[PDB]
């Protein structure tokens, strides 16, 4: 097999995610700017990494690539590339523009081209199941899109931006229903269980990426998207004892996302002196999970737990 | 069993709704306070017995309770005590605020912990079934919601209560397509078909709460809100006939809280002259079926055929 | 069976949306209202045409139109009378109001009337099956209340039109869930992939509808709109090498609502000048390929290959 999951991307994409939640907070706290610069080089050692190694993964695995890319559940796994592309493009935004606009667009058009060509396959029928209605879903469709539209965003494409932001937007609201409804009558493998926590993700990355959009004001569908991720936060909290039931696993990062958008979207609003004490709560609350993130991650990696 | 059904609870809850409605008219019509305090004193006293009752079961019939609690179905029947709680603290707001908050805040918390506790373990799969994708799934999800939501900003919590009321929305949002295909595909049960009036709840009642929210201004969404919960209206009434074709029972009751929330929508908006004579209508029509509602209601008290 | 299939009611329909995208041109360019008085006047009489055909269908086939009306699968395509109408009243609003009046409103009532009484009836089941989840649902559902939207604030009634467009937006969010999922699952066989194109037609449609009620002015929603309109129109465009595997035919005309819409939707954001680049190449698009639709149509005219 392959020593890296693709799944492994959301370590990247994680961290990635909340060195950009601790860059805006660069004016109120003079050690949130060196924190972001920290959690930023980290994230991009981190994509550079995997990069080579998928990159050796399709010169010498390629078959395991196909096998992922034509399978209806494992492809959702392959937009966390992009996405993590267009994540560490927002990071080098602060010290090199030039790149940083390079790594958005390639990015944006690598996720497109994936949701255009496969996402839309899946429509044909019968290589789709309705046990194949994962979380990880959300991924290419709905992930990818809203990444771009802050990516977009930050460059200034504020119309394309919106574009990305709404087709992301739709999409979720379109598959999540379908999604919990499998859940409620189908259940989830014990291994696919840890992939519950990007339930968790949309909702949070959908406001993140809206207040990044339209210049961080909290206008009221900021405050609705917050209710239903601090909604979905309460429903995956309640269930973590059964989404770890088999034990704590790499596969946990799934949940870093959410609390890395949840932490930005946190910040968003405190800037804008909305729900200040629920906007701390949020933040710690989104920090210190992803600390633990890290801590488990590098246990592994001590234990030899970590690579397949 | 028990005399007392748990859904017996939407004869509080709708009347209560009905008193906040008529009390949105203080201004215009001078009995219309006094309307509204009948109403609302007659669903207090109602709710207090229901209380009552139901602490009864628990004393001595708690097997029961934990029967329904665990049922995939019918435990979004028990979201009807809270809801009722906060639109009885709604109703006590007018005469003592302290004790309106106690009760607001207590069914908040309820709520919330119950959507929390055990709209949440039906994602662990195996107990709920397509079956069991029934109207009254709304309850926990989404009427306790949009009703927190608005029994806070009522409290002057706008903020809060527009998390909640997102929550809810998007709730709503999520869950009736599943359930309208499986109402297009499965039908539905004679005993279960009294439900149906739940349908035209989320679609008024999320209207109610956003305009309660944000001080009564007909936005846009209020509108769009109106256009789904009029489709969804005409779809009932051409219903009617089918879900009464074994005859009238007290579960015609879910329709009260739609019709209570209608009406109150309907104050609000000819409060903002929109749609004048659509809103004398909805609110006329309203009052008119709660009415036959509580004739039906006395009808089956006299003739004995209430308590089970 | 009868000459004409009830789904060929397409071509007015298409024809007269585009002829209300290009009559939004009307200062732009000089020979704008001449494209749109010549479409108009194309779809008017094709509409006429086949509205007599239908007349003479319900006088001396009427055994067709019931059989067609009763199954939950081919009912959705009545839809397309009333729309239908409804458009030839917008075109005709532009020369004799009144006339455009009466045919808006007749459109209105009766699609109103179709909704309630057939869409409706679905609830009681039994006869909708999950093989019947088709695109063509939409038509009936959404694309009906919004084209009424559309008409109804053409006419200067912006609150009911705001009512209608409202309406159908939220039953297009509600079902397009289960479709896609439905078409993920199965496999829509090749007779009825032509309407496919019927997937598109939503996301645009709602837009056109949107901007022709607030004043063309484009929002935050409108390029939400656009977001999942291209969305699916790159998706479909994937897809297309698979929705002809059999061959071109009549039931392309299914991408004429949605390229229609698109062009209006692209007039109206050009107005704004938001987009002007995307703008242009969606009416330049939609109206190719349009045009390549008709020229099919005339083709398997002159080859005989139109009539049943």
């Known amino acids: ?6 799944g492994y991307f959301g370590i990247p994409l994680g961290l990635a995610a909340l060195s950009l939640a601790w860059f805006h907070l660069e004016n109120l706290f003079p050690a949130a700017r060196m924190v972001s ?6 994230a991009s050692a981190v994509w550079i990494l995997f ?3 998928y990159a050796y993964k399709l010169r010498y695995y390629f078959e395991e690539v196909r096998a992922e890319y034509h399978s209806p559940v494992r492809f959702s796994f392959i937009a966390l590339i992009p996405i993590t592309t267009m994540l560490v493009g927002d990071i080098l935004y602060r010290w090199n523009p030039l790149i940083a606009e390079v790594l958005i667009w390639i990015g944006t058009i690598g996720q497109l081209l994936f949701s255009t060509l496969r ?16 979380p990880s879903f959300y991924l290419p469709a709905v992930a990818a899109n809203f990444t771009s539209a802050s990516s977009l965003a ?14 992301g937007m739709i999409a979720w609201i379109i598959f999540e229903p379908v999604l919990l409804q499998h859940l409620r009558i189908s259940s989830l493998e014990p291994q696919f269980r840890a992939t519950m926590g990007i339930v968790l993700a949309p909702a949070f990355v959908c406001v993140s990426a809206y207040l990044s959009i339209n210049h961080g004001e909290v206008d009221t569908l900021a405050k609705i998207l917050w209710g239903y991720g601090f909604l979905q936060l309460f429903f995956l909290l309640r269930l973590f004892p059964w989404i770890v039931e088999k034990g704590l696993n790499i596969g946990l990062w799934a949940f870093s996302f959410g609390l890395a958008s949840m932490a930005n979207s946190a ?15 949020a933040f710690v609350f989104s920090n210190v999970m992803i600390g633990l993130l890290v801590l488990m991650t590098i246990y592994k990696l001590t234990k030899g737990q970590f690579f397949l």
Chains 1, 2, 3 share one sequence.
């Open 51 to 53: 990069i080579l190694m």
């Open 154 to 167: 930050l460059l200034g494409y504020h119309d394309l931006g919106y574009l990305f932001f709404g087709a």
């Open 267 to 281: 910040t968003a609003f405190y800037h804008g002196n909305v729900l200040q004490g629920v906007s701390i709560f």
């Open 37 to 42: 610069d920290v959690l930023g080089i980290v």
């Open 1 to 6: 097999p392959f020593p890296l999951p693709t």
């Open 119 to 134: 996402v839309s396959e899946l429509w044909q029928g019968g290589v789709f199941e309705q046990k194949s209605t994962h």
